[PDB]
Amino acid sequence: CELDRDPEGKDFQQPYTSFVQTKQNRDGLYALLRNTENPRMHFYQELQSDMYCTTITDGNSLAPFVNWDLGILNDHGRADEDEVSGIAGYYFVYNRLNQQANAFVNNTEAALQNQVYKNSTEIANAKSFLAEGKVLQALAIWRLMDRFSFHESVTEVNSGAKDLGVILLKEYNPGYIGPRATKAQCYDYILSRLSEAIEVLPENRESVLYVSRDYAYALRARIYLALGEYGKAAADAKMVVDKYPLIGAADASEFENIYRSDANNPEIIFRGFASATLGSFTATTLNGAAPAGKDIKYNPSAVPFQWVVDLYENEDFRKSVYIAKVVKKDKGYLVNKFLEDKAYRDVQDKPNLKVGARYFSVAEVYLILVESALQTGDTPTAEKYLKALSKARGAEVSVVNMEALQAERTRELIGEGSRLRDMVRWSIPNNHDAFETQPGLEGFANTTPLKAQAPVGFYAYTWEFPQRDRQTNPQLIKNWPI
Amino acid sequence: LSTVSGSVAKVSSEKLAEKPVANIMDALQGQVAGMQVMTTSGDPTAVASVEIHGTGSLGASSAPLYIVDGMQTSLDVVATMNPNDFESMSVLKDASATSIYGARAANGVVFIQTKKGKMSERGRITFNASYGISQILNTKPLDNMMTGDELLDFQVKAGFWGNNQTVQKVKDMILAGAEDLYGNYDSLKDEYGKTLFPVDFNHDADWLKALFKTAPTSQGDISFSGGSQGTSYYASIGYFDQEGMAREPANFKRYSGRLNFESRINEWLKVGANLSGAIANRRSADYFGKYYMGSGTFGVLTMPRYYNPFDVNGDLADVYYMYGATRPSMTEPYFAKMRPFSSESHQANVNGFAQITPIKGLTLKAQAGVDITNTRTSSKRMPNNPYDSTPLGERRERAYRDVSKSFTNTAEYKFSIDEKHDLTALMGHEYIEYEGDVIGASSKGFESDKLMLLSQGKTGNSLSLPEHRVAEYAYLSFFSRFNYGFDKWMYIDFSVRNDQSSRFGSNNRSAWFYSVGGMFDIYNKFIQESNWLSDLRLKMSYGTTGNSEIGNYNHQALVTVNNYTEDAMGLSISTAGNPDLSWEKQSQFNFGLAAGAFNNRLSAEVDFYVRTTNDMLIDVPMPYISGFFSQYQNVGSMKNTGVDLSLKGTIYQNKDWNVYASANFNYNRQEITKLFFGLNKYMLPNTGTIWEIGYPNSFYMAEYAGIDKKTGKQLWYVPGQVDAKVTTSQYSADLETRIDKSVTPPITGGFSLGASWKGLSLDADFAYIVGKWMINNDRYFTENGGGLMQLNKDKMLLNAWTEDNKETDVPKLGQSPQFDTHLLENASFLRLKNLKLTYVLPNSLFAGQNVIGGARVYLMARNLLTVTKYKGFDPEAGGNVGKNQYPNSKQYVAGIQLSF
Amino acid sequence: ITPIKGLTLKAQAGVDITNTRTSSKRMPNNPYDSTPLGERRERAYRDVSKSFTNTAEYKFSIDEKHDLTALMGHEYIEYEGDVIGASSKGFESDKLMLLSQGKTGNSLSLPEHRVAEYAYLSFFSRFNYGFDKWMYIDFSVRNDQSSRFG
Amino acid sequence: QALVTVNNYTEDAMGLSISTAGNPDLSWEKQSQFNFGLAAGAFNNRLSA
Amino acid sequence: WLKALFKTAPTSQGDISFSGGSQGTSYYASIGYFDQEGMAREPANFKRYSGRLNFESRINEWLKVGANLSGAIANRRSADYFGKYYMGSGTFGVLTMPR
Amino acid sequence: ASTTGGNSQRGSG
Amino acid sequence: ASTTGGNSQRGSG
């Protein structure tokens, strides 16, 4: 009378037996990545900066990040099987990515030792897979470090935290509880991994849907700039900045139809697969978009302050695409960078506000090199690239001078979660209470004061560890004094 | 079913009858000693929660094992049956009674027996028919919320609209001038200002009647019984139709049939069979328990009174207006007709048995049965409505199947061997087995009501993927159980089991349990006769049970599909692993005493217990760095120590004029022993509760002090700091400490009355639960000046600390509140569950008429009186947290019975 | 129900339910196939016809050689049918062939759906006649409506 | 009935084609029987036809 | 080619049934199974699991009721390349396929 | 909208 | 293949 019952749908975990198996687990990892390094997940560190104010439509969904409600941001989020959101969710999905990747990276290494592959062509492809897993290992730890370890420039902290990283787990080991390792340990790990992969990935990108060597250098360049290694940041950026043309536009309308197209826009270095039936998603947090027949109507929970509008020259293409004058039909601006990609519509006539997961576009590598060059004293290759990017966008920049690098990086990366981290390296306090709201939206976007101030070196620019890992592991040093 | 060592309760047919509700278990509230039942939703689709004695485990389930006529069913099935078919209910609450069962008997069992007609020689035929309505018990929540322009000045003064603005500017046209919205829709373009004002700062509207209604309930029954030589039959047919009081649609209706039969074939063989079945439409309203701008009880309180969802005729409009909206928001009736739903379940239950008695003592008995339930369900998004995102429709069709079949055949050889040496030896086996199934398909792009077949859909980017789910388990158990006699006073009985389950691995599925207990008849031995004391029995038992209700696949190391592209599949890692997962094992010690006085017309029983859960099944929360959420593990232990007592009386005051009374009580104290990863406490994140090895399972917050009359800010006691008691103003995470309440209420039980006269009757059953606390999550919103300022709030925010006003205790406007103790309420209550008033027609009115010979008249009422401690609709509907809740209901019935 | 001697009132009802359910696969990876990708089709039928037929027959004699019976009642049949089907393709392993684990593009299909229903409403009457014990005469008459016609 | 069904051309709007001819006057097919019969049994109602 | 396309296929059935009655009440009851397998090597078969409970009773001298309930669980699979011309299948195959 | 102002999450049902 | 050589089509079933 045999009575063991196994589930339909699932299979057992086993060591990798055959090339084909390796390749499949490899897609599942790239599949997992699309729901991790995803625009919806960075909308938190976007709202917390000094650019937005909350409208009368919010139902306390954004106000905790926009207004620094520290009593909410301590515990914030969920990561059960019903929801995955907020700070808890950000913490979770990345650790899952490190863990699932650790399993890929190790099992493929094991498959090579046991000589499971068949010919030289499999074994070579295997090794390049292994290198791709190392880039994603690295992406996961750094994306966790950016939000959960203090910048080297912080005042009061919890006794013991000011030089620590994250719980660093380099193997598939879900049954581990340990303490956080040092900053010096994680940063050498992120960085070695990136380098071990660059010696192996081929020089020319093979698909825009898979980690390439061109991605690797652009990522390391991004990380160095956060560290401040302005010298090394520029030298990796150079390796790739010239391989991706900027968008060639004659007016605003021509710009919008290319920037919004994952398949055409020749600035994209790595993105996750997308169709209308797999891999699209709405990202309507910042614009409040909703279809009405074959039109589009707006009701946002945050609109930028007046001064964000004022970075953009009126003839700048981005002052109708990255931001768009669509609030109250035509009286104020909202951040429309994530409006749509029309290739994902179910029916051509009708908007569905679906977009794709983009991982690195070339406009960032330009703004990395300009800023690194300004610090290391290379004004030649620092207006060459700053004017080029500013002009191809419609408004070339007057002076090249780091005060203009700051406004131009802000102009290009709005909605992409870079302003908070930037205003910590540039030693900018919040000043939310002091800015002026858009005068066209009165009665709609009104002034709401802070619930905690954010002068420089305030601990709350870093997020607090989620109370699941605090509660489950009292060997963990938390970050906030409170 | 019951043993003489153990503790047992029995409810009669009389308590399981009418009660205008699909949830039968609602009738057992405060009706069995140690049977704590609570219904957390006033939805007709709802089924109550039951914990016998204690809460058994921390991960695995604690509801009792439900058994009808020998086969394990489920509260969902039991609701498709007709209660006038139910003969009695037995609650087997210790561990000697539940010693032949084997699945989750750790939580007791609950045994339903269906009517089988008394043999007699004629025939009985009864007819029932009742009608009634559901209303709503609590109105107090909206007795003190700001009115139309009451909260405008609240909003203006806190500058939520504009920095400097006047009350009229804020309405004069900012939102009274979003008639520009209505004039873009052809329907309402020229009915704004005519028949339909959706904003109005004068006559503010009634949001409660806009979102809740008085809903009718109707049922009726016809049933035949009778028998003859050695053969009996019961038979009934009946219908039931209850409609939910929420205007958001909810309802439940069944059409019931039952044919019960048993026959003595000869003096060596005898067989039986009872067959049931129904046809039921259940539709459940499910925006409840979630926070949505204008829906639910949360809506009736928060929606501003200057938003008006009625036409000029006092009738519900198709749509109302907020401010800044794109698309007008549709009301719950018009939403319902733009978004239809129907399910139809086809339930079947067959049960048969065969007894064979070869030689005197042994009684071989084989039993089998089957439970089939195919349900089928359709749902549409109606094409072309003006208030939608697109004007293209869609349709979803699902197809469920559930087929659990059981065998249980025993062989019992009783026989004496003295005159004072009785004995029985019983022993057989069981085999349950289950298979489930779901299928779903979806299609979109429809352009007309008449052309919405599933195969007439758009073809591209409009195609979907099907739905599919598959589930199956099994149980194989062997048992044995002997009873012993010595004279007529001393009883000893001892039993032993062996359970295997498919929910555990191949090297961990078996587990043996055993029971031992005994009874002493102190009246038939040591006191042979008396003048006041009728009966007196002392009994005691101890046994090990077993709990298994988790999930069917929670022990394997599994991989699923995660697809990246459209041209090859991909694999991701899905579940953690645990080869060593096995049974959670409990153990009970029961010591009890029963007695009866006057003339066995004054009875009472008292039992004391200790229930220990060892080798527990926790869904152990894992650290997120691991990458998973949970994994079930044999980890920890727990204790429930308590006592229950029941007693019934008979104060009858005449000779035809009876007066009855009965009461119930239980107190259980919980205590955790071992936890997971070596911890001594573990807070459940975002819940307000904690599992500390300390004592029970209790709330975990920050003790709230008040406000500083000097600064207007908020204060909190600091945990562990005293004055020669410290207060702070900067909320810290480490301001939170185990408060000494407890989530699972500790005192359960009720009491009932009874009376009479010449026919006329009146009966009253009460029930209570004391020591129950809840977090009024709704007050997080209605009681703060820090956010969500679009919403209406409690009148009290009109006294917040300023500088010109300073002698109150509602804090300054600018701050948001925390989940502390201004939200822990005492959700304790006593309910008057039923209140009947029957009148059996005089026997002398059926004189010449040989057609009848029976009649009665009802006038019932359920949940009509409730003792509010809680400040928010219904204190039952919740536990842990009290969200946008679906209140329980009050009913007014009126039945009529015809007997012949 | 037999109130008074001759008449025999008789009400009858019944119901016929039949839910069938059917699965079919093209097994992935065999060497002698067109592709090595599998597929699965799941169907769900339902048939529910219910009938009533209640008569009222009053037989009675009136002589010794004048027997008679007069019968007459009505019927109402009624039917509802139903089918549901879903298909998925691109499967790469025996253990992973759930219907929701299919390929996503040009691999998606359309569901299946069929719906059918009719009814019948008929009234009848039918008498028998006797004269002595040798001669019998009986005459009957109907009225049929059906949903199959306009 | 005189009926129209869906015939879809593109993926961005539905189309209608003509599906069945029509016949409002359709009604019952009507039959009629005339039966004339004779039955008998012999020996001892143990030989019938 | 005949043995290549057709087989000898087993068929099996069995039944248990109880009847009896008493004063004015009668019952029939049966349970049984059936399993016939098609002789075509191209798979075809039919199998049912049958139950039946028949009952009728005289309640009094004015009322009398009855009820008979049946039901089954059946697997029918039908071979359906027959009646069509395909190169190596069916009786058409046993004759036309070259030896 | 969907005002998730607090919404403390049920832990017992 | 599928040899529809003649295949006269059934008219009665």
Among B726, B744, B620, smallest CA distance to B682 is for B620
DSSP strand pairing (B215-227 vs B231-243): antiparallel
**In this structure, what token pair is assigned to residue B180?**
């520009």
The CA–CA distances, whole Å, from B610 to B54, B56, B591, B670, C8 equal 10, 12, 9, 10, 65
Q: Rounded CA gap, C35 and B209, in Å?
A: 62
As to burial, measured by CB atoms within 10 angstroms (0-12 exposed, 13-18 middle, 19+ buried), residue A421 is middle
Q: Which residues contact A41 (CB under 8 A, 6 or more apart)?
A: A89, A90, A93
Q: What resolution in Å is listed for this PDB structure?
A: 3.4
Tokens standing for residue C89: 């393709």
Under a CB-based contact definition with an 8 Å cutoff, are residues A237 and A243 in contact?
A: no
Residue ranges of domains in chain B: 1-117, 118-900
Which residues are A332's β-sheet partners?
Answer: A327
CA dihedral B807, B813, B819, B825 (to 10 degrees): 50
From chain C, pick out residues whose CB is under 8 angstroms from the CB of B470.
Answer: 98
Chain C touched by B648 (CB under 8 Å): no
- Distance between first and last Cα of chain B: 33
Residue with token string 């503790």: B7
Determine the residue among A60, A67, A73, A81 to mutate to test chain F binding: the one whose Cβ has the most chain F Cβ atoms within 10 Å.
A60
Phi, psi dihedral angles at B537 (to 5 degrees): -130, 135
Distance separating alpha carbons of residues B885 and F12, to the nearest angstrom: 15
Q: For chain A, how are helix, strand and coil distributed in percent, rounded to 5?
A: 40, 10, 50
SS3 (DSSP) at B728: strand
Task: Estimate to the nearest angstrom the gap between the alpha carbon of E44 and the chain centroid.
Answer: 13
Q: Which structure tokens are listed for B454?
A: 């599933």
* Cβ atoms within 10 Å, residue B476: 20
Which of B:737-766 have CB within 8 Å of F?
743-744
Distance in Å, alpha carbon of E62 to nearest chain G alpha carbon: 51
A472, B682 Cβ separation under 8 angstroms: yes
* Helices A19-33 & A86-113 angle (0-180, nearest 10): 160
Distance CA D27, CA D20 (A): 17
Nearest C-alpha neighbor of A227 from the set A112, A380, A324, A368? A368
- Cβ atoms of B63 and B91 within 8 Å: the answer is no
Question: Measured between CA atoms, how close is D16 to chain B, in angstroms?
Answer: 10
Which 8-state DSSP code applies to residue B733?
A: G
Query: E strands within B28-171?
Result: 35-38, 49-52, 65-68, 71-72, 86-92, 109-114, 123-136
Q: Which residues of A160-188 are buried (b: 16+ CB within 10 A; e: fewer)?
A: ebbebbbbbbeebebeebeebeebeebbe
Contacts of B24 (CB under 8 A, 6+ apart): B16, B75, B78, B79, B83, B86
Q: What does the block give as tokens for A64?
A: 């905790």
- Distance between CA atoms of residues B220 and B238, nearest Å: 6
Q: How far apart are alpha carbons A448 and B486 in whole angstroms? A: 84
What six digits make up the tokens of A144? 């966790």
Torsion of CA B453, B458, B464, B467, to 10 degrees: 10
Which structure tokens are listed for A173?
């080991």
Torsion angle, alpha carbons of A208, A210, A212, A217, to 10: 90
Q: Strand, coil or helix: what is B496?
A: strand
Distances (CA, A) of B166 to A34, A52, A446, B172, B364: 49, 26, 15, 10, 89
Interface of F with A (CB under 8 A): 1-6, 9
- What's the angle, vertex CA B308, arms to CA B303 and CA B313, rounded to 5? 145
C-alpha distance from residue A103 to each of A13, A26, A129, A185, B289 (Å):
11, 10, 13, 21, 39
Residue whose C-alpha is closest to residue B759's, from B855, B661, B662, B895: B855
Give how far F4 is from chain B: nearest CA, Å: 6
Contact yes or no for G2 and E86 at CB 8 A: yes
Phi/psi for B115 (5° steps) reads -50, 140
- In chain B, the residue whose alpha carbon lies closest to the alpha carbon of A436 is B163
Which H/E stretch holds residue B652?
Answer: none
- The experimental method, as deposited, was X-ray
Q: Decide if B785 touches F, using CB distance below 8 A.
A: no
Tokens of B298: 């949360």
Please count the other Cβ atoms lying within 10 Å of the Cβ belonging to residue B893: 20
Please, which residues have CB within 8 angstroms of residue A238's CB and are 6 or more apart in sequence? A369
How remote is the C-alpha of A455 from its chain's centroid? 25
Provide the token pair at B702: 């920050």
Strand partners, C23: C42
For residue B519, the cross-strand partners are B491, B539
CA distance A134 to chain B (A): 17
Order across the sheet with B689-692: list the strands.
B681-684, B689-692, B698-701, B737-738
State the Rg of chain E over Cα. 23
CB of B233 less than 8 A from some CB of F: no
**Contact criterion met (CB < 8 Å) for B788 and F12:** no
Sign of the Cα torsion B727, B728, B731, B736 reads negative
Chain C neighbors of E63, CB-CB under 8 A: 1
Q: Do D14 and B445 touch (CB under 8 A)?
A: yes
Q: How many CB atoms lie within 10 A of CB D37?
A: 4
Token output for A200: 């192996």
At A214 the three-state DSSP class reads helix
In sequence order, the 6+-apart residues with CB closer than 8 A to the CB of B418 are none
**Is E23 at the interface with chain B, CB within 8 A?**
yes
> What is the C-alpha separation between E55 and C114, in angstroms, rounded?
37
Distance CA B456, CA A328 (A): 39
Q: Do chains B and F touch (3 or more CB pairs under 8 A)?
A: yes
Token match 């009986």: residue? C138
Phi, psi of A216 (to 5 degrees): -55, -55
In angstroms, the Cα distances linking A254 to A74, A207, A267, A297 are 44, 26, 15, 22
Q: Do A60 and F1 touch (CB under 8 A)?
A: no
CA distances (Å), origin B732, targets A73, B704, B729, B818, C7: 12, 13, 9, 11, 88
What gap in Å lies between CA C70 and CA C124, rounded to an integer? 11
Q: With an 8 Å Cβ cutoff, is A285 touching chain B? A: no
Asked if residue B845 lies in contact with residue B802, where contact means CB atoms within 8 angstroms, the answer is no
Neighbours of A275 (CB within 10 A): 17
**CB nearest to B123's CB, from E21, E51, E60:** E60
Angle at B548 between CA B558 and CA B467, to 5 degrees: 45
Q: Collect all residues with Cβ–Cβ distance below 8 Å to B880 and sequence separation of at least 6.
A: B687, B688, B689, B743, B774, B775, F10, F11, F12, F13
Cα–Cα distance measured from residue E39 to residue E3, given in angstroms and rounded to the nearest whole number: 11
Q: Are strands B829-836 and B341-356 parallel, antiparallel or unpaired?
A: unpaired
Helix%, strand%, coil% for chain G, nearest 5 = 0, 0, 100
Helix or strand holding residue A130 (H, E): helix A120-148
CB A133 within 8 A of CB A108: yes
Amino acid (one-letter) located at C89: K
Q: What is the DSSP string of B773-785?
A: EEEEHHHHHHT-S
A-chain residues within 8 Å CB-CB of D13? 347
Q: Which of B852, B808, B886, B815 is nearest to B246 (CA)?
A: B886
Using CA atoms, how far apart are residues B301 and B320, in angstroms rounded to an integer? 16
